[PDB]
Amino acid sequence: YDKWEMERTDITMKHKLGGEVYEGVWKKYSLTVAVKTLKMEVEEFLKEAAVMKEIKHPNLVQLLGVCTREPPFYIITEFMTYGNLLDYLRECNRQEVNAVVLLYMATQISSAMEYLEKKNFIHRDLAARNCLVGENHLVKVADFGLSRLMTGDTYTAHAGAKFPIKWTAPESLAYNKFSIKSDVWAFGVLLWEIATYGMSPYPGIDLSQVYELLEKDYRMERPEGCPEKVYELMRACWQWNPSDRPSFAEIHQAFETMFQES
Numbered sequence: 454y455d456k457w458e459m460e461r462t463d464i465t466m467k468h469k470l471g472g473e474v475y476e477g478v479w480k481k482y483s484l485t486v487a488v489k490t491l492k493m494e495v496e497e498f499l500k501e502a503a504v505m506k507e508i509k510h511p512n513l514v515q516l517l518g519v520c521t522r523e524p525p526f527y528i529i530t531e532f533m534t535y536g537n538l539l540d541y542l543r544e545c546n547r548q549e550v551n552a553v554v555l556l557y558m559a560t561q562i563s564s565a566m567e568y569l570e571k572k573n574f575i576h577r578d579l580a581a582r583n584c585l586v587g588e589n590h591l592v593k594v595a596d597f598g599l600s601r602l603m604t605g606d607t608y609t610a611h612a613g614a615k616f617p618i619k620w621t622a623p624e625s626l627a628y629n630k631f632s633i634k635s636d637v638w639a640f641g642v643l644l645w646e647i648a649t650y651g652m653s654p655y656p657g658i659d660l661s662q663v664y665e666l667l668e669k670d671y672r673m674e675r676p677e678g679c680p681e682k683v684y685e686l687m688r689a690c691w692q693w694n695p696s697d698r699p700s701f702a703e704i705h706q707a708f709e710t711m712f713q714e715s
């Protein structure tokens with residue numbers, strides 16, 4: 454798609470942000486942008502740009518342009534001024550980022566995931582570190598790793614793939630299998646990260662025993678201050694059987710109701 458194509462000279466790099474990711478300026482609009490460069494495999498990078506062209510949602514990071522004719526290749530996106538959600542929650546004023554703001558953040562993220570669910574994408578690395586925060590608690594999900602997968606289907610990760618174990622669904626840990634329901638599992642963990650203002654999940658629990666614990670129905674306990682209804686949602690996301698987990702449309706509806714009633 455050539456409406457997306459721009460010359461690399463249209464952008465000036467201002468600050469390196471790691472991970473081959475720069476804060477840049479789109480000079481004709483004096484616009485601050487994020488720029489991902491390639492110093493992963495080329496074809497993988499180009500397909501990631503291709504997927505992002507199809508994505509249009511208020512809570513998914515918006516593609517602005519690509520430079521894909523000649524190396525080095527660029528993917529240019531909107532810039533989210535406050536950076537990743539994990540550090541944002543860890544460093545925030547909790548009187549400002551209070552319970553209703555946490556609900557608002559969860560509603561936004563579930564809205565993005567509902568859109569992906571509907572458009573046959575999976576994310577596969579849903580976590581606070583991969584959400585970005587703009588002004589007035591706007592949250593966007595980073596969408597650079599999206600894979601096409603018809604919502605009824607399963608992706609099998611390449612042999613020897615390494616996971617973020619504590620965000621990873623049981624079926625992914627055991628069988629390298631991913632679906633939108635494994636994104637639902639990860640969303641549950643993300644909810645826990647939000648509720649704890651960015652605590653690390655399963656604290657102190659040895660990574661090699663996480664799977665064994667999950668199969669015996671161990672789950673993280675309700676965070677201090679966490680509303681019971683939100684915790685119930687976490688627990689639904691963490692059902693062992695992927696088909697028992699709620700869809701993102703249901704999750705989003707549930708949060709929309711909670712947020713509106715707050």
Ligand SMILES: COc1ccc(O)cc1-c1c[nH]c2ncc(-c3cncc(C(=O)N(C)C)c3)cc12
Nearest residue numbers: 470474487488489514528530531532533536537
């Ligand atoms: C081409 O865009 C990307 C490619 C890779 C990536 O990981 C993210 C982005 C991305 C898009 N919009 C963004 N808006 C803002 C920031 C950003 C600003 N400041 C600090 C941080 C941060 O938390 N750390 C550096 C740890 C992130 C990143 C982005």
